[PDB]
Design an enzyme around this catalytic site. Structure first.
Site, PDB file in Angstrom:
ATOM      1  N   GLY A  82     -25.511 -26.724  28.679  1.00  8.04           N
ATOM      2  CA  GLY A  82     -25.065 -26.883  30.042  1.00  8.04           C
ATOM      3  C   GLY A  82     -24.351 -28.214  30.211  1.00  8.04           C
ATOM      4  O   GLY A  82     -24.630 -29.189  29.519  1.00  8.04           O
ATOM      5  N   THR A  83     -23.366 -28.210  31.104  1.00 14.87           N
ATOM      6  CA  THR A  83     -22.597 -29.421  31.343  1.00 14.87           C
ATOM      7  C   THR A  83     -23.523 -30.568  31.682  1.00 14.87           C
ATOM      8  O   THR A  83     -24.405 -30.452  32.534  1.00 14.87           O
ATOM      9  CB  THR A  83     -21.603 -29.235  32.483  1.00 14.87           C
ATOM     10  OG1 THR A  83     -20.625 -28.262  32.109  1.00 14.87           O
ATOM     11  CG2 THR A  83     -20.917 -30.556  32.796  1.00 14.87           C
ATOM     12  N   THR A  84     -23.330 -31.676  30.988  1.00 10.36           N
ATOM     13  CA  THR A  84     -24.104 -32.863  31.269  1.00 10.36           C
ATOM     14  C   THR A  84     -23.952 -33.224  32.738  1.00 10.36           C
ATOM     15  O   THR A  84     -22.849 -33.200  33.294  1.00 10.36           O
ATOM     16  CB  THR A  84     -23.679 -34.022  30.371  1.00 10.36           C
ATOM     17  OG1 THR A  84     -24.567 -35.126  30.572  1.00 10.36           O
ATOM     18  CG2 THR A  84     -22.244 -34.444  30.643  1.00 10.36           C
TER      19      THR A  84
END
Lengths: 75, 77, 244, 217, 243, 244, 250, 41
Positions: free
Chosen positions: C30-32
């Protein structure tokens, strides 16, 4: 000297110590050894006043597959 | 495994004997230092050491450190 | 045996659910994204990865708000958290419908963790592939929470999720040490921006966009709102300077 | 007084102070007094735990009864105590009843008062419901007879005791009856019999654990 | 076939491994906790571990106040803890609602145990890998200790502990209690009882504890509550005196 | 996914067989031998108490021969528990039928009633069948005495005499040997007892090892009278067989 | 969610067997050996109170439990399974019997009723059979004292006396040795003590052991007076005292 | 086979009795001693 082995103590005695005087050719100790179990032997072997021979199956492991049983007989 | 104490214990043992600043972060590392072993502690040192040689440090700096610490706490616990 | 992972609710021989643990896999993927509880309140910062020019700037929005005081953001499969988010939006509504108050962050925190954990309870229920950083200002201050597919969340002086969380967790730890006082939302805004870029260095391979939102007992009064325009642009260049 | 400790303790004290006989005025009163509840297990007073504690006296107080010879008192009461632990628990009888009488086998008794009361309570088993180890008492009764050197009495009883203990009743006891029986035989100098009995016992003895005393015996 | 491992059904040996694996997730969080009935009171001591600064430590607890009277400490996954507590919390009020008086502690445990027992027998339900610990001062029973497992199995305790080193703490208190022969601490002030436990906690853990280190809760007549770090430290003060 | 766990009870053999049904039948082989006979004047019910012992209490004990109605009682081959279910139901069903028409149920109706009920598990539900089959002993207005049977498959037939449990073929042979249409109950009684004693797998055929019953229109009658014999009575008639 | 295990979990073996049941029996056999004895004057049941830790308070666990003032139960197996069944048993008794008939069911029906449940576990999907079997004793007006044994098979039958759990075989062996018809409860009580003593390995006492009887009605236990018709429960549980009292009577 | 063990013990007795002469009594013991084992495991 591992306390309470009487029946077993007598048993060996019944098994060997007595018949040494007067019938099995061989006797099996079964269980965890050196627990007093192996100690049974030496203790017995001590009293017995016969020529004692310990053997290890863990001893016969020499490449010389030619000798092998040779003293296993003669021993 | 060493406790948070045992770690901190071993921490300042295995680690701090490698040259380090007081800037180098002693307990907070240990705080993030969990489920490590004695050599994992050393890894913590050794890992920061990467960043050290990466930051040009004979003395480890806190910078080197907790990057490692998590990074040490990363792969396993 | 084996294949314990192959069904959700199953306990591994060590007593674990690898599905959730596997769900955790994409969570990292998942996107940081990060979140910060400043002095009065909280700030929500997320990188918006730009896939292409055809993407329209600012339009696809990650951080989602629950009620009006609660922002939420998550690394993971977007539709998941969204689905979850709605339920939270439901929860507070019911809660407020019953309790006439907007919901306390921790209250709100709890309800979800159950619903997530619910998806740990059945081999037919697919755990969540997201972990939401969420919170806001409530009756007592703010709170900063990040809930795992494990059904575990916590109070967070700072929170980070997704790929670059390490770079984040670094910086967060620093500001804790830099500012055990607290932090101004403004700096909370600013610092996160730096953190994000720093966090982006893992994903540095592609350009992105920066979305940050916040809930300030002071500045949003306790509302949850985005960072926008200059103040948004501020923290950008503030970071875009500091990144160099 | 009036208290489960006090009087009993007094009855204990008045021994420690002086003697049971002074204390008997408390001891007798122990039976005569102390409780509002349960059954009249005391022969005068109505009591539950107290009687058990009155027994606690009556044990001592029994050997004090013996030390009085009020064993003779307690002799007849031994029937009553039976009904009194029947006023409590039939098993508790069997315990205490036996206990008492055995304690009357202690603190030297005439074989009679034993036999006399044994034979009493032996039957007083039956009269209640009990076929059950009245033989045990009867064993002692036989042992009494054995001590009375009534081996006829013994063996006749024994053979029943046997036929009883022959798995119509206990094997562990059946071990011991042999032993007594062996002794019986031995005093009768019936060796194989004594042997057989002892042998049968000794082998049967191995099936269970036997009293170290018994084992030693 | 081998799915018996995966689901809840008797092993060829008649065993539930999902259960037994749930017994794993118990100490998975690796918290050694304890509970002791004091004289009038009951005290629970537990490890409060904070791995991260970025956390809110204060938000970290496995000791949960189920009722006004009943607190509960949990050993296992925090979600199940966060799960189970609510379930309990639902019960008491409803019990209180239905029955007019607050649920005595055991009943809760007895109640909660059923759920596991349900989960135990139910397949699609997995059990929860938490062990629950129910104490409070029961107006009828005064101090009382109840601990439930994922099996739906539970019992009273003179005292009890839970954790990886639970075994040793068990021994320590057994020794102590055998030494004391009494089920509960003689100490009237839970304060001492807290310090007493922490002692034996420090003792049987061989481990010293700071104010943050410990999660602590106090069962009192009609009220359960948890101490501050100050109270903790306050106890930590006097223990440093006696020891 | 749940699929892993389904034994898929009702699915066909490649040969179009239902192994559960097969295996249920198989357990019935293991079931205590139970026999029944429609005599001219009545119907006989005798079954072996199986797995018996000293402290086993015989008198209250009925593990096999149960009475659905005063014109319908049954012997049970299979799990004692499972039948009692069906036993109870049928009674109600009959009672309902009675309560419906104020008239007793023609046996097959009740029989076919249970028949499809078994068949219920057969064709749907993913549910194991019952490991039970039955001797249906009944008297009606229409056919008078009626001796029916059932299998977990629900398939069911009428009989002049029948046996179930172990040694059926043996019994069946003995029965299909020794039976004759006009047999009086008391003949069939011993005949079964003969068959029983012979088909008895244990050493001796003894009352305490048996359940026994009869449906008979008595001599003073117009009420066709079911009777289960008491152990002594069984033991008594046990002697009358000369079996003693 | 939405339990999709609707399918019977235990299925007939190629050999025509139900393994879970068999394994339940396995687990049941694993159960703490527990006994029951139906005497003339009444019935007694007994089991060893198992302490997995002295810190734990044994009495807080009851393996014997009254179902009705004349009926109480005991098991060998997983405590929890026994636990819930008790409640249902208690409940169904009130509901399906008392709340209909205003009284406590004859031992058989309740037993028959209980076993019904255990069967259901065997059959219905999503559930497994219970990890216990039950020794159940009750006195009713017409059938008097009776003693029953229910399996995870949901099968149940009467006994003169019996035992379940591990040593039960050895017990039942000695039981058959000891048992007669004319045994009065106390001897039977004493008998059970003797018997269970064998199944007992560690400490043997009222604190280690759980005893209860189906006795004569107990007006004291009735909790009130003034009703002639109701003289109280026939069931009672025995005190470690009373136990240890008769453990003297050993 | 079990009979043999009885005999052996009878001798085992007698041997322990120092007898090549066995009584019946010995056998009668071995019965138990074997039926010990027969009842044993």
């Amino acid at each position: 000297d591992v306390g309470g082995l009487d029946m077993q103590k007598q048993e060996i005695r019944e098994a060997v110590e007595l018949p040494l005087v007067q019938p099995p050719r061989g006797v099996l100790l079964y269980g965890p050894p050196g627990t007093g179990k192996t100690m049974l032997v030496k203790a017995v072997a001590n009293s017995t006043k016969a020529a004692f021979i310990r053997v290890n199956g863990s001893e016969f492991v020499h490449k010389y597959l030619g000798e092998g049983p040779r003293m296993v007989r003669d021993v | 495994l060493p406790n948070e104490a045992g770690r901190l214990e071993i921490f300042k043992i295995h680690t701090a004997k490698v040259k380090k600043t007081g800037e180098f972060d002693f307990e907070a590392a240990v705080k993030m230092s969990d489920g490590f072993n004695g050599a994992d502690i050393r890894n913590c040192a050794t890992e920061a050491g990467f960043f050290a040689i990466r930051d040009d440090r004979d003395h480890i700096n806190p910078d080197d450190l907790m990057k490692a610490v998590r990074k040490v706490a990363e792969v396993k616990k | 045996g084996t294949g314990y992972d192959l069904s959700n609710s199953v306990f591994s021989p060590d007593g674990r659910n690898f599905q959730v643990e596997y769900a955790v896999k994409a969570v990292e993927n998942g996107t940081t994204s990060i979140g910060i509880k400043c002095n009065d309140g909280v700030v929500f910062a997320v990188e918006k990865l730009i896939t292409s020019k055809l993407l329209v700037p600012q339009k696809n929005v990650k951080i989602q708000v629950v009620d009006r005081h609660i922002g939420c953001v998550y690394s993971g499969l977007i539709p998941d958290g969204r689905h979850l988010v709605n339920r939270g939006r439901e929860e507070a509504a019911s809660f407020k419908k019953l309790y006439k108050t907007p919901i306390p962050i921790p209250a709100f925190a709890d309800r979800l963790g159950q619903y997530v954990q619910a998806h740990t309870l059945y081999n037919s229920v697919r755990p969540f592939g997201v972990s939401t950083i969420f919170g806001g200002v409530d009756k007592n201050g703010a709170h900063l929470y990040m809930l795992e597919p494990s059904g575990s969340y916590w109070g967070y002086k700072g929170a980070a999720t997704g790929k670059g969380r390490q770079s984040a967790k670094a910086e967060l730890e620093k500001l804790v040490d830099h500012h055990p006082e607290g932090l101004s939302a403004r700096e909370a805004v600013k610092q996160a921006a730096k953190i994000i870029y720093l966090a982006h260095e893992d994903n540095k391979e592609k350009d992105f966009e920066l979305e940050i939102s916040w809930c300030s007992l002071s500045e949003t009064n306790g509302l949850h709102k985005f960072v926008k325009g200059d103040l948004l642009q501020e923290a950008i260049d503030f970071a875009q300077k500091e990144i160099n | 007084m009036s208290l489960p400790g006090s009087k009993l303790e007094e009855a204990r004290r008045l021994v420690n102070e002086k003697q049971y006989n002074e204390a008997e005025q408390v001891y007798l009163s122990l039976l005569d007094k102390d409780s509002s509840q349960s059954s009249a297990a005391a022969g005068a007073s109505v009591d539950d735990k107290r009687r058990n504690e009155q027994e606690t006296s009556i044990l001592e107080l029994g050997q004090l009864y013996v030390t009085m010879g009020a064993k003779d008192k307690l002799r007849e009461f031994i029937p009553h105590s039976t009904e009194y632990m029947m006023q409590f628990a039939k098993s508790k009888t069997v315990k205490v009843l036996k206990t008492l009488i055995e304690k009357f086998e202690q603190v030297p008794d005439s074989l009679d008062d034993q036999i006399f009361v044994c034979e009493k309570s032996i039957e007083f088993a039956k009269r209640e419901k009990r076929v059950f180890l009245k033989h045990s008492l009867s064993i002692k009764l036989a042992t009494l007879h054995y001590q009375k050197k009534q081996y006829k009495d013994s063996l006749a009883l024994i053979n029943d005791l046997l036929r009883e203990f022959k798995k119509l009743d206990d094997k562990p006891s059946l071990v011991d009856v042999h032993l007594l029986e062996s002794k019986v035989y031995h005093k009768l100098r019936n060796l194989a019999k004594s042997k057989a009995s002892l042998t049968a016992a000794r082998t049967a003895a191995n099936s269970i654990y036997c009293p170290t005393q018994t084992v030693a015996e | 076939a081998g799915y018996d491992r995966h689901i809840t059904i008797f092993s060829p040996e008649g065993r539930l491994y999902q259960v037994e694996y749930a017994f794993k997730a118990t100490n998975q969080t690796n918290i050694n906790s304890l509970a002791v009935r004091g004289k009038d009171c009951t005290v629970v001591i537990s490890q409060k571990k904070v791995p991260d600064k970025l956390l809110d430590p204060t938000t970290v607890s496995y000791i949960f106040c189920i009722s006004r009277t009943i607190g509960m400490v949990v050993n296992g996954p925090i979600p199940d803890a966060r799960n189970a507590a609510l379930r309990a919390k639902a019960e008491a009020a409803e019990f209180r609602y239905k029955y007019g008086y607050d649920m005595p502690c055991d009943v809760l445990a007895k109640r909660m145990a059923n759920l596991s027992q349900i989960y135990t027998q139910r397949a699609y339900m997995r059990p929860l890998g938490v062990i629950l610990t129910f104490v409070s001062v029961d107006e009828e029973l005064g101090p009382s200790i109840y601990k439930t497992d994922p099996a739906g199995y539970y019992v009273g305790y003179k005292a009890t502990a839970t954790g990886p080193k639970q075994q040793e703490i068990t021994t320590n208190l057994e020794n102590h209690f055998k030494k004391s022969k009494i089920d509960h601490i003689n100490e009237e002030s839970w304060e001492k009882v807290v310090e007493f436990a922490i002692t034996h906690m420090i003792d049987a853990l061989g481990t010293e504890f700071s104010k943050n280190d410990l999660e602590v809760g106090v069962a009192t007549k009609d009220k359960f509550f948890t101490l501050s770090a100050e109270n903790i430290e306050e106890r930590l003060v006097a223990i440093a005196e006696q020891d | 996914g749940s699929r892993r766990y389904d034994s898929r009870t009702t699915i066909f053999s490649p040969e179009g067989r239902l192994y559960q049904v097969e295996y249920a039948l198989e357990s019935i082989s293991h079931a205590g031998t139970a026999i029944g006979i429609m005599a001219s004047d009545g119907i006989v019910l005798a079954a072996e108490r199986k797995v018996t012992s000293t402290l086993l209490e015989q008198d209250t004990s009925t593990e096999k021969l149960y009475k659905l109605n005063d014109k319908i009682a049954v012997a049970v081959a299979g799990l004692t528990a499972d039948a009692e279910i069906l036993i109870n139901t049928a009674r109600i069903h009959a009672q309902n039928y009675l309560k419906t028409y104020n008239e007793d149920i023609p046996v097959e109706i009740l029989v076919r009633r249970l028949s499809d009920i078994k068949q219920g598990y057969t064709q749907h539900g993913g549910l194991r069948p019952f490991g039970v089959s039955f001797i249906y002993a009944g008297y009606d207005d229409r056919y008078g005495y009626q001796l029916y049977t059932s299998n977990p498959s629900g398939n069911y037939t009428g009989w002049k005499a029948i046996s179930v449990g172990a040694n059926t073929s043996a019994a069946q042979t003995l029965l299909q040997m020794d039976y004759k249409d006009d047999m009086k109950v008391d003949d069939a009684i011993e005949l079964a007892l003969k068959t029983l004693s012979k088909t008895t797998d244990s050493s001796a055929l003894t009352y305490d090892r048996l359940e026994f019953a009869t449906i008979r229109k008595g001599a003073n009658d117009g009420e066709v009278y079911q009777k289960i014999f008491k152990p002594q009575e069984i033991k008594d008639i046990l002697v009358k067989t000369g079996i003693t | 969610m939405t339990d999709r295990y609707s399918f019977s979990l235990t299925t007939f073996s190629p050999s025509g067997k139900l393994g879970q049941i068999d394994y339940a029996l396995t687990a049941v056999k694993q159960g703490v050996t527990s006994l029951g004895i139906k005497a003339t004057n009444g019935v007694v049941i007994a089991t060893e109170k198992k302490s997995s830790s002295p810190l734990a308070m044994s009495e807080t666990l009851s393996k014997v439990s009254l179902l009705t003032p004349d009926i109480g139960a005991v098991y060998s197996g997983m405590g929890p399974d026994y636990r819930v069944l008790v409640d249902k048993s208690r409940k169904v008794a009130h509901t399906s019997y008392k709340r209909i008939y205003g009284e406590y069911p004859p031992t058989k029906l309740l037993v028959s009723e209980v076993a019904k449940i255990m069967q259901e576990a065997t059959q219905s999907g999503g559930v497994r059979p219970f990890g216990v079997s039950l020794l159940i004793a009750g006195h009713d007006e017409f059938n008097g004292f009776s003693l029953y044994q229910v399996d995870p098979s949901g099968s149940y039958f009467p006994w003169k006396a019996t035992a379940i759990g591990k040593g039960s075989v050895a017990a039942k062996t000695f039981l058959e040795k000891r048992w007669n018809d004319e045994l009065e409860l106390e001897d039977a009580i004493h008998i059970a003590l003797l018997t269970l003593k064998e199944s007992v390995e560690g400490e043997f006492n009222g604190d280690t052991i759980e005893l209860a009887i189906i006795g004569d009605e107990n007006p004291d236990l009735l909790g009130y007076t003034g009703i002639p018709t109701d003289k109280g429960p026939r069931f009672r549980k025995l005190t470690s005292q009373e136990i240890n009292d008769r453990l003297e009577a050993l | 086979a079990d009979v043999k063990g009885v005999c052996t013990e009878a001798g085992m007795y007698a041997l322990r009795e120092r007898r090549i002469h066995v009584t019946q009594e010995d056998f009668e013991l071995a019965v138990g001693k074997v039926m010990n084992k027969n009842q044993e495991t």
